Amino acid sequence: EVQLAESGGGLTKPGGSLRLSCAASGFTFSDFYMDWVRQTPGKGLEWVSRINNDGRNKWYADSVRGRFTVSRENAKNTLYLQMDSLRAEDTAVYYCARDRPVYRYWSGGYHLDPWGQGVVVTVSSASTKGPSVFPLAPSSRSTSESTAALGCLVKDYFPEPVTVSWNSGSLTSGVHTFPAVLQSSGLYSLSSVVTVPSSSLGTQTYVCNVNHKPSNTKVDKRVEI
Amino acid sequence: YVVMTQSPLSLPITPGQPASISCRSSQRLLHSDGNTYLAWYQQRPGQPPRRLIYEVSKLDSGVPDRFSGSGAGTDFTLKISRVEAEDVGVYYCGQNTYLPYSFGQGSKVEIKRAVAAPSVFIFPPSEDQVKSGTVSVVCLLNNFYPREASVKWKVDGVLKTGNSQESVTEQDSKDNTYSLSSTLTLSNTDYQSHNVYACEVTHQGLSSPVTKSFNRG
Amino acid sequence: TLQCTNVTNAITDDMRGELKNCSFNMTTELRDKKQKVYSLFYRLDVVQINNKEYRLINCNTSAITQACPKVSFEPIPIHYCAPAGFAILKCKDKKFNGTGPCPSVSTVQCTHGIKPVVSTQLLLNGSLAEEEVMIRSENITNNAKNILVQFNTPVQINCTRPNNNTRKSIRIGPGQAFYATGDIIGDIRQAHCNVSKATWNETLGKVVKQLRKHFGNNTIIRFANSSGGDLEVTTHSFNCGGEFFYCNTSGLFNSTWISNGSNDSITLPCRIKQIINMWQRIGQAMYAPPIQGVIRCVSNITGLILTRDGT
Amino acid sequence: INNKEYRLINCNTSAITQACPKVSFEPIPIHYCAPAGF
Ligand SMILES: *[C@@H]1O[C@H](CO)[C@@H](O[C@@H]2O[C@H](CO)[C@@H](O[C@@H]3O[C@H](CO[C@H]4O[C@H](CO[C@H]5O[C@H](CO)[C@@H](O)[C@H](O)[C@@H]5O[C@H]5O[C@H](CO)[C@@H](O)[C@H](O)[C@@H]5O)[C@@H](O)[C@H](O[C@H]5O[C@H](CO)[C@@H](O)[C@H](O)[C@@H]5O)[C@@H]4O)[C@@H](O)[C@H](O[C@H]4O[C@H](CO)[C@@H](O)[C@H](O)[C@@H]4O[C@H]4O[C@H](CO)[C@@H](O)[C@H](O)[C@@H]4O[C@H]4O[C@H](CO)[C@@H](O)[C@H](O)[C@@H]4O)[C@@H]3O)[C@H](O)[C@H]2NC(C)=O)[C@H](O)[C@H]1NC(C)=O
Ligand SMILES: *[C@@H]1O[C@H](CO)[C@@H](O[C@@H]2O[C@H](CO)[C@@H](O[C@@H]3O[C@H](CO)[C@@H](O)[C@H](O)[C@@H]3O)[C@H](O)[C@H]2NC(C)=O)[C@H](O)[C@H]1NC(C)=O
Ligand SMILES: *[C@@H]1O[C@H](CO)[C@@H](O[C@@H]2O[C@H](CO)[C@@H](O[C@@H]3O[C@H](CO)[C@@H](O)[C@H](O)[C@@H]3O)[C@H](O)[C@H]2NC(C)=O)[C@H](O)[C@H]1NC(C)=O
Ligand SMILES: *[C@@H]1O[C@H](CO)[C@@H](O[C@@H]2O[C@H](CO)[C@@H](O)[C@H](O)[C@H]2NC(C)=O)[C@H](O)[C@H]1NC(C)=O
Ligand SMILES: *[C@@H]1O[C@H](CO)[C@@H](O[C@@H]2O[C@H](CO)[C@@H](O)[C@H](O)[C@H]2NC(C)=O)[C@H](O)[C@H]1NC(C)=O
Ligand SMILES: *[C@@H]1O[C@H](CO)[C@@H](O)[C@H](O)[C@H]1NC(C)=O
Ligand SMILES: *[C@@H]1O[C@H](CO)[C@@H](O)[C@H](O)[C@H]1NC(C)=O
Ligand SMILES: *[C@@H]1O[C@H](CO)[C@@H](O)[C@H](O)[C@H]1NC(C)=O
Ligand SMILES: *[C@@H]1O[C@H](CO)[C@@H](O)[C@H](O)[C@H]1NC(C)=O
Ligand SMILES: *[C@@H]1O[C@H](CO)[C@@H](O)[C@H](O)[C@H]1NC(C)=O
Ligand SMILES: *[C@@H]1O[C@H](CO)[C@@H](O)[C@H](O)[C@H]1NC(C)=O
Ligand SMILES: *[C@@H]1O[C@H](CO)[C@@H](O)[C@H](O)[C@H]1NC(C)=O
Ligand SMILES: *[C@@H]1O[C@H](CO)[C@@H](O)[C@H](O)[C@H]1NC(C)=O
Ligand SMILES: *[C@@H]1O[C@H](CO)[C@@H](O)[C@H](O)[C@H]1NC(C)=O
């Protein structure tokens, strides 16, 4: 069955360049047009570029024209996007997708199907930086409730992700971990939180266990009055 | 450029019920070969966009027959005759007739469930927050419905709004509630100025906004 | 001397090379000045020197003339007429077989409108038989003779060149222009002809049931493709839209007939040429100028030029 | 051409023939005549 897969996404500073690859499987790749399409968490889906089957013809969105070039190697069943002059706006997931068939006597309609697994691309000048780990200790009020809550504001790390868990990683009951806030410093932060019957506090030690895998900085910080 | 837009932005739907999504373009999508290259995609949480419908009405391979699609000129509809749990996600119409290809802003599907109040909590800042150049005072809304909520901020009776960042779960996969946090990040001196913080929750299902507190010490 | 790359096509081998992008130096309006120029050329217009160096097919045999762009090749009907004191006699016998006494006759000034359509293997747009698929030869019992068959009803062939070529003009001398192919818009796809399989299968059935008169009922009879020779004769070579096509007919003539859906039309791939000779000649070649846009033409096949081996 | 460089007027439109020096352009009287029976 037909499949596409992508590689080469990651972090860069602005003004630099990145090259993405998409590799094709389960079809004669030189019978098809191909497309790059990106998703931004804000604006949603945005078209980026298209290439025909022999590679003679190429098209671009205004936001990327001349900054990016699309290219293909039919002998390798493979497609590349060479991005240059990157900006913070180019931060997205990039997906490749398959378009118009050109069978030996006949050309089909336009399509985007199927789509790849996608590659993350991030454009910022910030340092690879480990998290601050701030307890959001249970209030005196929280501690008087039948069920208390408490949390942990993992803060000022870059890039994403931080992976977070409670009480030596053993606790998942009543746990939420919020999607990260991108702060106006260009650094991320998030809160983990846990809700518990208030007798449980100190009867078990409340700890946010944290790792920032881009640096493998990890912290196991207690969260009590 | 050709603009695309979908009329319902979010649809709380009960499992088993029909749902429908209008889509409209700035210009006619019928192409010079006589086809109309509109299509519909869905995106479940944490997954790439999956095409469902193309050339206005044809189905993609292995698409469940409860999906259907129709329209003409500029005006088009998806319809699902009954929603399943695997229909929870975001739906986009898009067009391939004119370059650049373009997509609607998309519509959310969520499991309609009983309106429920947030259990409200608040957290005294840590010994390192207390000396950090800004102090994120934090409030939590736990397992409520619908999604619509935000937190007012107070300390020593003083209304302290204008400094607050917020972040939210998607719909819970097991009980179908939401959780939300609010994060009043003051400068150190402007935090240090005041003593008894109170976070004052506004939510669509609360009978009055609910205020929870802590005392510095 | 031409320097030629392939056009950027990356398909099956040798088919990548079916058209070439050749560049060369050429004279200008001024005697003392050359220009560097390029054109697309089909593989059959050129030959390699020995490396990426090529020359036109004709330079070691013939001078060459560009066919003027304004004069049409369309086969306009001609009537042939006799001078005063002479007469044309027309045979009226519907089952006349090309020789001997025609028992029914009329006289006219001129023939009906005859189209000078030129085509090998198959006869296009020409007159149908009066009734039955009539067969004619001067001696059927000799295998060396061609055998014309003439259908009582047409079978329809649709031919196309789906590449959208551009015309380009180069001045080569003071007041003289050469028309090159500039480039191609959009997708490359093969030039081809289609004929409906049910009607061709049925019509080939009718030709067998008439050969069964001259060869008897016991014989299973067979069709085969042409065995070899020049491209002009091994293919259904013909003109459409003012392009010259050379379709591989092996999809038509490939069946064996007993003594006793369907909408899937068969399709014949065709090669194309620009440098050509009138088939009864050598020593003077012609260059057919390139045609803008997509080509289509629709035509009736109405007869065949068969041959026999010796079931 | 563009400088002190020139070409003939015709080289971008037409070929050119020398009129032979012997053949006269002089207009000589022609009488037009009708065939017999006209
Ligand atoms: C002279 O004669 C020539 C023929 O001799 C003639 O050339 C032919 O022209 C016709 C048009 O008239 C061309 O028809 C196209 O055929 C495509 C596939 O063709 C290749 O593969 C098939 C395999 O069998 C399938 O296809 C036939 C149709 O041919 C169907 O009836 C079958 O049910 C079967 O379907 C499966 O495959 C499809 C994908 O290919 C799937 O979409 C479908 O769901 C099934 O899985 C071969 O039969 C073909 O051979 C032919 O050529 C020989 C040559 O001798 C003929 O004898 C013979 O009769 C055959 O014609 C060939 O090898 C079709 O895909 C294509 O339809 C697509 O385009 C339209 C317009 O956009 C869409 O409406 C339609 O839905 C299809 O789009 C889908 O498919 C594309 C890829 O093709 C996808 O990218 C796209 O996303 C879309 O969705 C599909 O994929 C999704 C997954 O990604 C999935 O979710 C969707 O649900 C869907 O599956 C169209 O019918 C024919 O190919 C030409 N042949 C050649 C070789 O060129 C010529 O025109 C004549 N010229 C003149 C002058 O007369
Ligand atoms: C057949 O070969 C010719 C020559 O390679 C191709 O045409 C184009 O020729 C020009 C110079 O005569 C090349 O230069 C230019 O490139 C820049 C790129 O930024 C462009 O902006 C200029 O306008 C100019 O065209 C050009 O690179 C070359 N094109 C290619 C694709 O190589 C001709 O296209 C070839 N034919 C086919 C159908 O491939
Ligand atoms: C057999 O007879 C048919 C019918 O006359 C021929 O088809 C016609 O061929 C011409 C080629 O000159 C086709 O091309 C051009 O079409 C445009 C209009 O689209 C017209 O302005 C041009 O004058 C020219 O006719 C024409 O489309 C085509 N079809 C019809 C119905 O006329 C056919 O070419 C003949 N077969 C052979 C082998 O000559
Ligand atoms: C050859 O082309 C002709 C049309 O040029 C096809 O005949 C019909 O054409 C009319 C008018 O466009 C259409 O309404 C019909 O649908 C066509 N017939 C079919 C079967 O679709 C003819 O079919 C073609 N024949 C081949 C062998 O390709
Ligand atoms: C074949 O290629 C030519 C290239 O000249 C295309 O010509 C177009 O003609 C229209 C006339 O309205 C112009 O507006 C366009 O600018 C031309 N160029 C393009 C790229 O379209 C012609 O459309 C092509 N035809 C087919 C059937 O492919
Ligand atoms: C050109 O085509 C021929 C035949 O397929 C092949 O041998 C040769 O390597 C090709 N060269 C290029 C530049 O594509
Ligand atoms: C054109 O002429 C120059 C010399 O003036 C020569 O170097 C070049 O190789 C020639 N090019 C071709 C394509 O023949
Ligand atoms: C012309 O060149 C071709 C190259 O293939 C060769 O076959 C042919 O015999 C040559 N003819 C003459 C008259 O030299
Ligand atoms: C045509 O019929 C005449 C009748 O005498 C016969 O001599 C001749 O051989 C026949 N030719 C063919 C091709 O049938
Ligand atoms: C055909 O030619 C052969 C000699 O090749 C001869 O024997 C035979 O009689 C001829 N048949 C007819 C019908 O003329
Ligand atoms: C062949 O069959 C037809 C009937 O289909 C018959 O009229 C004819 O006389 C037969 N000829 C021979 C030699 O059997
Ligand atoms: C005739 O058809 C056979 C099919 O196997 C093929 O091998 C042969 O090359 C063909 N000949 C011509 C002249 O097309
Ligand atoms: C003609 O087509 C047949 C298949 O139909 C192929 O085997 C043969 O090689 C082709 N002939 C030529 C001259 O390419
Ligand atoms: C020939 O050259 C003259 C130079 O002024 C120019 O005006 C004229 O348009 C040209 N004519 C052609 C047909 O190129």
Burial class (CB in 10 A: 0-12, 13-18, 19+), C283: exposed
Residue C306 CA, ligand 9 centroid: distance in Å = 18
Q: Are strands A119-123 and A11-12 parallel, antiparallel or unpaired?
A: parallel
Q: How far is it, in rounded angstroms, from Cα A162 to Cα A130?
A: 9
Q: Does A193 touch chain B (CB under 8 A)?
A: yes
Q: How far is it, in rounded angstroms, from Cα B96 to Cα B51?
A: 13
Residues written for chain C: 311
Place of tokens 């129709």: B70
This structure was determined by: cryo-EM
Q: How far apart are the first and last CA of chain C?
A: 53
Residue closest via CA to ligand 6's atom 7 equals C14
Structure tokens at C152: 């009582």
Element (H, E) at B52: strand B50-54
Q: How far is it, in rounded angstroms, from Cα B34 to Cα B39?
A: 16
Q: Tell which residue, C136, C135, C281, has the closest CA to residue C210.
A: C135
Amino acid symbol at A202: G
Of the options 3.40.440.10, 1.20.1050.10, 2.60.40.10, 3.30.499.10, the CATH number for the domain spanning A3-123: 2.60.40.10
Residues written for chain B: 217
Binary contact (D12, C171; C-beta < 8 A): yes
Structure tokens at A206: 């409340």
Name the CATH superfamily for A132-223. Immunoglobulins (2.60.40.10)
Contact in structure between B94 and B41 (CB atoms under 8 Å): yes
**Which residue ranges make up each domain of chain A?**
3-123, 132-223
Amino acid symbol at A211: N
Structure tokens at D12: 């971008």
Residue D17 CA, ligand 14 centroid: distance in Å = 20
DSSP C310: -
Helix (H, G, I), strand (E, B) or coil at B97: coil
Contact in structure between A18 and A91 (CB atoms under 8 Å): no
Q: Does C46 touch chain A (CB under 8 A)?
A: no
Q: Does A75 touch chain C (CB under 8 A)?
A: yes
Structure tokens at A73: 């190697």
A7-23 burial string, b = 16+ CB within 10 Å, else e?
Answer: eebebbeeeeebebbbb
Backbone CA torsion sign across B201, B207, B208, B214: negative
Which residues in C28-62 belong to E strands, given as ranges? 34-42, 46-48, 53-56
Structure tokens at D13: 């439109």
How far is residue C218 CA from its own chain's centroid?
Answer: 36
Place of tokens 């005294």: B124
- Those residues whose C-beta lies under 8 Å from the C-beta of residue C205, and which sit 6 or more positions away, are C257
- C contacts of D9 (beta carbons < 8 Å): none
Q: How far is it, in rounded angstroms, from Cα B104 to Cα B89?
A: 15
Structure tokens at B213: 């507190």
Contact in structure between C37 and C23 (CB atoms under 8 Å): yes
Binary contact (A54, C188; C-beta < 8 A): yes
CA distance C255 to chain A (A): 25
Element (H, E) at B192: helix B188-192
Helix (H, G, I), strand (E, B) or coil at A201: strand
Pocket of ligand 2 (CB under 6 A): A 56; C 7-8, 21, 38, 183-184
C70 Ramachandran zone, left/alpha/beta (phi>0; psi -120 to 50): alpha
Structure tokens at B44: 């479940």
Q: Tell which residue, C32, C180, C131, C121, has the closest CA to residue C301.
A: C121
Structure tokens at C199: 């009607």
C24-61 burial string, b = 16+ CB within 10 Å, else e?
Answer: beebbbeeeeeeebbbbbbbbbbeeeeeeebebbbeee
Q: How far is it, in rounded angstroms, from Cα B69 to Cα B49?
A: 17
What DSSP assignment string belongs to C16-33? GGGEEEEEEEEE-SSTT-
Contact in structure between C210 and C133 (CB atoms under 8 Å): yes
- Residues A47, A49, A53, CA angle at the centre, nearest 5°? 130
Q: Does B48 touch chain A (CB under 8 A)?
A: yes
Q: How far is it, in rounded angstroms, from Cα A103 to Cα C240?
A: 23
Beta bridge partners of A6: A22
Q: How far is it, in rounded angstroms, from Cα A74 to Cα A94?
A: 21
Structural gaps in chain B: residues followed by a C–N separation over 2.5 Å:
none
What DSSP assignment string belongs to A84-135? -S--GGG-EEEEEEEEEEEETTEE------SB---EEEEE-----BPPEEEE
Among the partner residues C30, C171, C175, nearest to D15 by beta-carbon distance? C175
> Residue A30 — φ and ψ, nearest 5°?
-75, 5
Binary contact (A106, C188; C-beta < 8 A): no
Q: Are strands C284-287 and C63-66 parallel, antiparallel or unpaired?
A: parallel
Contact in structure between A68 and A60 (CB atoms under 8 Å): yes
Instruction: Give the CA distances from residue C239 to residues B16, C118, C120, C161, C273, in Å, rounded to whole numbers and listed in that order.
Output: 64, 7, 10, 12, 10
In chain A, which ranges are continuous DSSP H helix? 140-144
Burial class (CB in 10 A: 0-12, 13-18, 19+), B124: buried
Contact in structure between C121 and C112 (CB atoms under 8 Å): no
DSSP B145: B
Q: How far is it, in rounded angstroms, from Cα C11 to Cα B215?
A: 76
In chain C, which ranges are continuous DSSP H helix? 197-215, 231-234
> Residue B83 — φ and ψ, nearest 5°?
-80, 140
Using a 6 Å cutoff on CB, does residue D13 contact ligand 14?
Answer: yes
Helix (H, G, I), strand (E, B) or coil at B175: coil
Q: Which atom of ligand 3 is nearest to the CA of C239?
A: 38
DSSP C210: H
Place of tokens 């293919």: C235
Domains of chain B: 4-111 (2.60.40.10), 119-215 (2.60.40.10)
